[model samples]
Target: PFTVSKGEELFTGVVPILVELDGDVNGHKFSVSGEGEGDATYGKLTLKFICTTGKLPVPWPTLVTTLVQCFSRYPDHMKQHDFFKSAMPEGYVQERTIFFKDDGNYKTRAEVKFEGDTLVNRIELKGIDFKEDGNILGHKLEYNYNSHNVYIMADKQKNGIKVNFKIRHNIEDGSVQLADHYQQNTPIGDGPVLLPDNHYLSYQSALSKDPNEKRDHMVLLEFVTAAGITLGMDELY
Candidate 1:
């Protein structure tokens, strides 16, 4: 029995208390629920943290502080991009959130369940704007893993488009390879082995290089182009 506390009898029988935390940083809300030994001489502290970011995802270290450092890097670019306006965090949120909204192209909110590496998204055509309806309304998209690809199917009946689009791209002067296949129907007049010649553009996914902000994952948003396989607009042009 050694004197852990230098006081008269500051040694054994000390209750080990736990501390929990929940708060926000720079408007980014977060919750920290962890258990620690205590705030004493021999107190052992371990913590688990999470930040609220809806669209722009940080690939590693789930920490709220990382969100700050990432968002703080490019003040100008952040404002120019409207997607950051609807950024969400970790948790449940009741809103027809915008995954990416700019110009006339966007991905609205709905029910998205992610299991392992596959993401299932279900959308409704009711509240969304009529313009964007033609593209996303009543659509169930499945994205598997981190690849630039998605398998799209009709959420409702009607004459819907059934096809899977995949894009292979790189960030450093990389080439964009896009392919779309019709899983259900064919062309109006016996479409040849393929459809046309030019119909897409090159694409690349890159991180912000402002030497500070590592938050922005930039990509050109375009449904289709006249450049042979256009899924996402190649912004480098």
Candidate 2:
């Protein structure tokens, strides 16, 4: 038994003092407890090395470089790019939605599901038909992007079409346009590829079709380059 107050007891057995090491690396400093227990004789034998490595606190420029390398997009090959390495955390699921509007009416929406940085699948909702006779009907498009080509399945058709995606960047206006090239190589002679409907551009091509014969050319979408637009984690990855 030991002499003590009603509820005040400092120690019931022998206590060993703990040793901590202060480590400094780069511009950061941290503390760590000594490893292992000392010998039972004269205070336990705890061993530790002074040399250590720690995470460095960095400026904005250094951090920006790390993010740019991970999320920068290349115009040459838009398909095979590692822009989502560090942008997407582990096991994170993201949904990307692109809305379509005709004048003031809500046309439809396109949804893309992504797992981490990889695009899992894509779907577009059907909207109003251009004509009542079903001449230019609007239907759902289920597409799969692989490597450099886009395989499109329209309206649950029996056979789908594979369209080669050609990405062209215009330095004049700093704009980007995607063209879907289709030919007679496939079974279908002429079919509309899922792309932005360029009405005026098609008219100009038809007027100059006398000498410069044009094939069944189609335009998917066009984008003008601009800065200061911040994309969220799910929006990009």
Candidate 3:
């Protein structure tokens, strides 16, 4: 489903990308409330995640905090790679980021690119004597649309835990996956009312790890797509 004359159509509504671009480690707080500052796409998200299918690593929120400190670029370039990965013909494939930072106040840097629809997101979090490298997420859009079924390989610094997971569509046909456990859409005992993708979308992650100390986490994740759209009490959960 790759096409030109229309720009590199990423999952423009991808909450994780939007979260990274927004560059916040505080769970998209404050700005999620329409306060001080935010990107134009900020208000269109109602985001959350759960480990309904399996057990999440302990202190998951902390790990999420550190992951947020990795990889970013200058604004225009950010939009280019994310919003126009295949749109721009040439001139920007590899770059040295100079205009991005995160809650850590250190330079959130990365060496990212695309060979067609595949995005190689190799990122690092520069810390005090801890330049965590190889925290990468390699992605390729496989869905026959503007979206993808992504593969993630990220290391959780605080625990020496390595995460290798593959996320794919479990509920197609204009439907979304419930966020492990959605609030209002709970149906028949487990999961949301089987939320529908506005063509929005839903995904399941087959996440596992090495069986070492502070590791060995085999988990499952069902995620809801919050593309600035809300469910109107539909019976599609």
Candidate 4:
């Protein structure tokens, strides 16, 4: 179901890793690695969340402007609040940020990591603040390739909402599939209709050939494998 090889076995020289993903609206964005920029072993990861003006229920730009103006006018008032002091007990560290493409139409703050075949991401939005109490904290989102599931946890202030969706791999054609609605986890869904065809995923790989050059007169058969995934579509509603 997966591929494995020691790093030393993959390369004789210093291991080089690179990854990049590109896609159209209709297709899944799959990361590819090649020479020059990098090989197949390492990469930079970023996820973007966007809501278009037409698609959004609220006017996001106006909302952000208003919020910014209020915060700017009363900066000291907000920072001195118990919620601000406690929410970030250690104070705020400026973590790396991935910006929205549509002028803050929708705010997104996320941290993504890959552990084996699982992808774990924590997210905090400008508007959606969920915590165990009245504080503000991030939510958890996970994608498990082995389990074929997408798990989400939010509304942390209250009892919390936990839910998962079904995702399967079409091994024969290599298509990634998603179920119509939630799979009735801690939080359930009510839906009978399906759109499995329009809402599927596909992948493309650009693995390099075996290393032929010699390091100290020894031939090396080398390749690198590194991967990452973002749960949402890019610039999509």
Candidate 5:
């Protein structure tokens, strides 16, 4: 049988065990405060993971490898590399496209969209570049939702600059809403561009209303970028 002692200072042991049991647990710090009185004496165990401030390095190699592998498994349209370049117009390549599979694992495809064009679609997926080796690059997805239109646009910048769109939900029922409208300007002609700056913009909104007049609008935005990326001149109102 296993027994725990109060204020026994089980820093290394308890911390590891708790972390393993919880799996990917964060926001916890542990401190043992108290005195042990025989087997009945106890101590206070405080656990937390500080999330206030810290620099998280991006796993570039891992990210690239993972994206390549995942894209290789998908079809032409569904694949990031072939999609972005083939959808959007020139200058508008691909920034990023986050593909979420049913298994919960996700693949981020990024590219440049255009040079200096403003896109006004709900959600958009664009294409970027393609290599003869069958490894396609430069693909991204853009999503925009405002108080008027709650839809998504898909653009393929690589091939013919194809553009597509999708609605978030039924507008007739007023099931979706947009709040806090904002705009962003991005730099192009680089590697997988970071989102928001790559060709993504978003705002806050709520869907269903509660009896207490509480509105719960799901936050919407573009694909999450790799850690350490910076957002350029963007405004939110």
Candidate 6:
């Protein structure tokens, strides 16, 4: 059962509680409930959390705070950009892919999932149209892990993206997860790969650079540019 509590000197105990429900067409009813634990030293304190609801309340403050904090680094004007604005959603899931008509032009696609106020998950893909031209232009995937509030943009370029395995709790803190910063000019063959955890901090530091620089850097980091347009992942893995 879900529970919540706050107190000092926690102890364990059991108690029978009554729950009241409102807004039910069948009228409000009470249910017998049992809870264990109390605030006691050397013991554990637990409080059972229960609620009656037709819908769960969205944490608007947290959602807004998160978006503001995360997107603040980008310019307000940038928010108007198709790539950025396209990711915002009112509710549920939304997906869009914008493709340039010209051959060899870049394409950008994004999928956004909304849970109430929070943008729960988003995946963006950017790459050149390889079908139009055999030229090996690269593609990258930017995955926003909203539940943990982290973001990781993995690029598939020549010479696989370096992954120095490092155990880190939160990947979205804007850190590089690679040890070798060497640029790979050739096309990568292994397809998409998870970046190494070691370089995560460095990658994050790079993202957190000066605002203007960070914004521009993110553009390059997230996509392979051909025209002014960005590309989206052709398919989910």
TM-score each candidate.
0.20, 0.18, 0.24, 0.16, 0.17, 0.18
Winner on lDDT between 3 and 5 is 3
Say which candidate scores most in TM-score.
3
**Which ten-residue region of model 4 has the weakest summed lDDT?**
65-74
Consecutive 10-residue window with the lowest summed lDDT within model 3: 179-188
Flag regions of model 2 displaced more than 4 Å: 1-106, 129-224, 228-237
Compared with the true structure, the alpha-carbon lDDT of candidate 1 equals 0.22
User: Residue 17 in model 6: shift from native, Å?
Assistant: 38
Task: Report lDDT (CA) for all predictions.
Answer: 0.22, 0.20, 0.24, 0.22, 0.21, 0.21
Report clash pairs, candidate 1: 52-89, 53-88, 53-89, 54-88, 199-228, 200-227, 200-228, 200-229, 200-230, 201-230
Q: Please give, for residues 32-103, the per-residue lDDT of candidate 5 as tens digits.
A: 111111110111122221111222111111121111000111222222322222223322322233222111
lDDT tens per residue, model 6, 16-40:
2221212111122212111222221
**Per-residue error (Å), model 3, residue 49:** 19
- Model 5 residue 71 CA deviation (Å) reads 4.7
Q: Write the per-residue lDDT of candidate 3 for residues 1-237, one digit (tens) a residue.
A: 244522233323332322221122222211111101111233222223333323331223222222211121113313321212232222121212221111122223333333353333333333222112211111111122222222222122221111122222223345332111111111112211112212212232233333452422222222322232333566555
Candidate 6 regions with alpha-carbon error over 4 angstroms: 1-90, 105-109, 115-117, 124-216, 219-237
Candidate 4 lDDT (Cα, 0 to 1) = 0.22
Q: List the residue pairs that clash in candidate 2.
A: 38-44, 38-45, 39-44, 39-45, 195-220, 196-220
Sliding window of 10 residues with minimal summed lDDT for model 1: 64-73
